[PDB]
Design a protein around this ligand. Sequence first.
Ligand SMILES: *[C@@H]1O[C@H](CO)[C@@H](O)[C@H](O)[C@H]1NC(C)=O
Ligand SMILES: *[C@@H]1O[C@H](CO)[C@@H](O)[C@H](O)[C@H]1NC(C)=O
Ligand SMILES: *[C@@H]1O[C@H](CO)[C@@H](O)[C@H](O)[C@H]1NC(C)=O
Ligand SMILES: *[C@@H]1O[C@H](CO)[C@@H](O)[C@H](O)[C@H]1NC(C)=O
Ligand SMILES: *[C@@H]1O[C@H](CO)[C@@H](O)[C@H](O)[C@H]1NC(C)=O
Ligand SMILES: *[C@@H]1O[C@H](CO)[C@@H](O)[C@H](O)[C@H]1NC(C)=O
Ligand SMILES: *[C@@H]1O[C@H](CO)[C@@H](O)[C@H](O)[C@H]1NC(C)=O
Ligand SMILES: *[C@@H]1O[C@H](CO)[C@@H](O)[C@H](O)[C@H]1NC(C)=O
Ligand SMILES: *[C@@H]1O[C@H](CO)[C@@H](O)[C@H](O)[C@H]1NC(C)=O
Ligand SMILES: *[C@@H]1O[C@H](CO)[C@@H](O)[C@H](O)[C@H]1NC(C)=O
Ligand SMILES: *[C@@H]1O[C@H](CO)[C@@H](O)[C@H](O)[C@H]1NC(C)=O
Ligand SMILES: *[C@@H]1O[C@H](CO)[C@@H](O)[C@H](O)[C@H]1NC(C)=O
Ligand code: NA
Ligand code: NA
Ligand SMILES: [Zn+2]
Ligand SMILES: [Zn+2]
Lengths: 369, 369
Amino acid sequence: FNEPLNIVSHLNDDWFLFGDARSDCTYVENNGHPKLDWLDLDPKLCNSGRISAKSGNSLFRSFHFTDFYNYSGEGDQVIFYEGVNFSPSHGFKCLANGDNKIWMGNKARFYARLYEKMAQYRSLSIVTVSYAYGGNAKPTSICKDNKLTLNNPTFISKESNYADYYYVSEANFTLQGCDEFIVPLCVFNGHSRGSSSDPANTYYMDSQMYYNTVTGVFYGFNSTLDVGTTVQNPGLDLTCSYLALSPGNYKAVSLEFLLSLPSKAICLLKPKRFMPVQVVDSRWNSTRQSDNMTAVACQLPYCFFRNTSADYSGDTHDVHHGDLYFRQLLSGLLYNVSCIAQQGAFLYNNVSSIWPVYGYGHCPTAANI
Amino acid sequence: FNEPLNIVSHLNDDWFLFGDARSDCTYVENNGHPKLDWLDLDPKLCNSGRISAKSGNSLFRSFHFTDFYNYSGEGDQVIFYEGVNFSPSHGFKCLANGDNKIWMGNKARFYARLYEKMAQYRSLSIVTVSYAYGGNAKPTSICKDNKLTLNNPTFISKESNYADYYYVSEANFTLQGCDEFIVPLCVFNGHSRGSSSDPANTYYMDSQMYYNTVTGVFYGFNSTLDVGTTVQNPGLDLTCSYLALSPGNYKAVSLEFLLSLPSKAICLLKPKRFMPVQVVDSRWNSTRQSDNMTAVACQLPYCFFRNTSADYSGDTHDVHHGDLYFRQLLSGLLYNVSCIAQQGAFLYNNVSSIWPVYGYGHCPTAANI
Ligand SMILES: *[C@@H]1O[C@H](CO)[C@@H](O)[C@H](O)[C@H]1NC(C)=O
Ligand SMILES: *[C@@H]1O[C@H](CO)[C@@H](O)[C@H](O)[C@H]1NC(C)=O
Ligand SMILES: *[C@@H]1O[C@H](CO)[C@@H](O)[C@H](O)[C@H]1NC(C)=O
Ligand SMILES: *[C@@H]1O[C@H](CO)[C@@H](O)[C@H](O)[C@H]1NC(C)=O
Ligand SMILES: *[C@@H]1O[C@H](CO)[C@@H](O)[C@H](O)[C@H]1NC(C)=O
Ligand SMILES: *[C@@H]1O[C@H](CO)[C@@H](O)[C@H](O)[C@H]1NC(C)=O
Ligand SMILES: *[C@@H]1O[C@H](CO)[C@@H](O)[C@H](O)[C@H]1NC(C)=O
Ligand SMILES: *[C@@H]1O[C@H](CO)[C@@H](O)[C@H](O)[C@H]1NC(C)=O
Ligand SMILES: *[C@@H]1O[C@H](CO)[C@@H](O)[C@H](O)[C@H]1NC(C)=O
Ligand SMILES: *[C@@H]1O[C@H](CO)[C@@H](O)[C@H](O)[C@H]1NC(C)=O
Ligand SMILES: *[C@@H]1O[C@H](CO)[C@@H](O)[C@H](O)[C@H]1NC(C)=O
Ligand SMILES: *[C@@H]1O[C@H](CO)[C@@H](O)[C@H](O)[C@H]1NC(C)=O
Ligand code: NA
Ligand code: NA
Ligand SMILES: [Zn+2]
Ligand SMILES: [Zn+2]
């Protein structure tokens, strides 16, 4: 009786879901399809006002790229069902001979930071970050391919006066309006190249740091790796950490190569008593390649991970939208549960055959009477 | 029935207590005192082999100063009952016109780091950290008064060749034998002075960073404050952060003033499933001045704080040792409890009149039948 249910749910109405197409009710189609057939989310929750979802997007995608959706929401119990819209299938690399594994590493670190903070905070949004630059050089879109263009962090071009990339550059940026900010601190870890016409011997070792003008704290990344830009020596891409920062006046200091600074930040507002987030596995139909980065990111004590036991098998829309088991997994949002724990959600508050671990809410005992 | 009990306890025998005189059974006295009267700990637990306690010491004290005890222990449920042996009563300052509030800030940050990590790790110990220095200058004991001498972090003297403190200095240190290390990264935030014979205009702005040679990550502190060493402008002391670092080859880089590097580290071994530590308020009889830094440090979800409702009132030993209510609070260690939660320990696993919050173990329901 009252076994842990493999669902995502809520203790009350104070909940919010962040998602993608599988939770996006505003999507339109002109065909002989059943109404809202792309959804894993139940159609009854479309008018709930507790969902931030966009077809073809994710939190990581909007945080880093020009394909931007203004994800925003507030809730005590935060649920995530997105992440698939930046996967190994997309195969993004900043450079022709880059590395997707680095970008999966970035995905894991971003979500880890986001999940941990959203266990301490009610509100999430994405705000624009402006910068003051004393030079004449303007932003350069270095990290991109033919599908995606990265715009966070922003990269500042070399000044016209400098012949090489052995220069020191800096810029100021203010973080205002939020209790905490998640910003990317990134670096090209390896041998970077200036212009395609430079000799084969001259390479640059990227260095970047962020500096708090008030507290004097600085966090930085120096280049250490051997990987590069050529076919003979490949691997160089953009490794990012995701820092939780207080509001204040910050300085971005680059000691070598391009100056990089945040253009976007995850705005964290309204602190709450510790309440772990719920994360639903976000993967393709196994014809496309997925990753378990969100699972790597989803750890105790800040996060509970939920997954089905089957391949993702779309019903009528396509192979990637409308899975029966994920529909049932998400169906838990239609009602309140008494206890949300590691194993799953316990519907009732009194007794169970299973002892709840890391339980939140009004949790049942597994004792006799 | 089965109300939360204001005690520290354990779910099984897999527990360890870190303490001071109030838990130190090896202490000796030649007088007409009752046996073991300085203890808050029950005498029956003296031979338990689950206590690391020393009369007149604490974790912070041993971590920073020459008054060192080799605190070591392993347990799933870690309990702390120490901290009073570095308090505002001691009034420690690195410099004559320093600031004790900075050192209380340091106390809060150290314990916060320690408590959070000891919720993820079974084993705690203090290991010596060695360094490689290419110069001739040897350690200088700059931070001290007439009671305490700081030896962590170690400070390296200025070289004989340098006329001033506007130099760049660096040293290597290896961290080996532990899964994670807690080390202090400290700085004199303000206007530092070289020799007492230097003019009134020449001051130095302390800068210190630690650098991972492999990953390229660096964490640093620059001086920003206006406080100094004189009577006219006082306040300058040593502000420390407490970093959790992986094993590896590290570089300590100082851009101005003295080079500082860790001599001691909290060695973290044997990762465990998340289990919050229990912390008992460590304060003097109200005749001496105490602090609530360990309470500031003890936060959800990694820590449960326990306090009595009375002044600390010693029975026979002195005013600072052997309190009835703390004895009863610690008496919970004599037996197992079913559930350890935020409000306290629930003895029984079945029913309660109170809903446990952040419960660990086999926790009771507050429902009817
Ligand atoms: C950045 O801030 C500093 C203050 O520390 C100021 O001196 C400098 O002019 C600022 N830079 C720009 C480009 O405004
Ligand atoms: C980091 O890189 C910069 C630029 O190459 C260099 O000047 C600096 O010494 C490096 N930092 C360390 C700690 O080696
Ligand atoms: C993720 O997948 C890798 C192999 O691809 C595996 O080693 C790892 O344990 C997985 N982690 C999680 C949290 O699923
Ligand atoms: C993908 O989805 C379809 C359902 O539309 C299912 O038949 C198939 O097993 C899934 N996996 C594949 C093709 O690998
Ligand atoms: C969940 O509980 C709240 C009050 O605690 C109530 O307003 C709401 O109707 C419940 N949710 C559903 C989906 O019925
Ligand atoms: C709960 O367990 C305790 C100890 O076994 C027992 O005294 C009590 O009768 C039990 N209460 C209920 C309602 O089962
Ligand atoms: C510190 O390590 C570096 C390697 O990065 C080495 O060049 C240097 O000689 C070392 N310093 C000392 C004093 O051994
Ligand atoms: C930190 O202090 C050093 C030494 O005074 C200085 O050279 C450096 O520019 C400072 N860093 C920043 C970011 O201002
Ligand atoms: C500690 O004491 C200060 C005042 O001395 C108070 O403002 C603060 O709330 C206290 N915090 C805790 C956790 O006891
Ligand atoms: C300190 O302890 C004694 C018990 O020995 C008690 O009488 C007193 O109330 C305590 N507090 C003081 C003196 O402020
Ligand atoms: C606590 O439980 C363990 C086994 O779970 C048992 O060995 C031990 O005797 C109990 N503790 C006490 C103090 O009786
Ligand atoms: C637990 O509560 C549920 C729902 O109210 C009820 O069906 C069941 O009888 C209760 N079980 C016990 C043992 O009280
Ligand atoms: Na750079
Ligand atoms: Na220094
Ligand atoms: Zn469709
Ligand atoms: Zn005595």
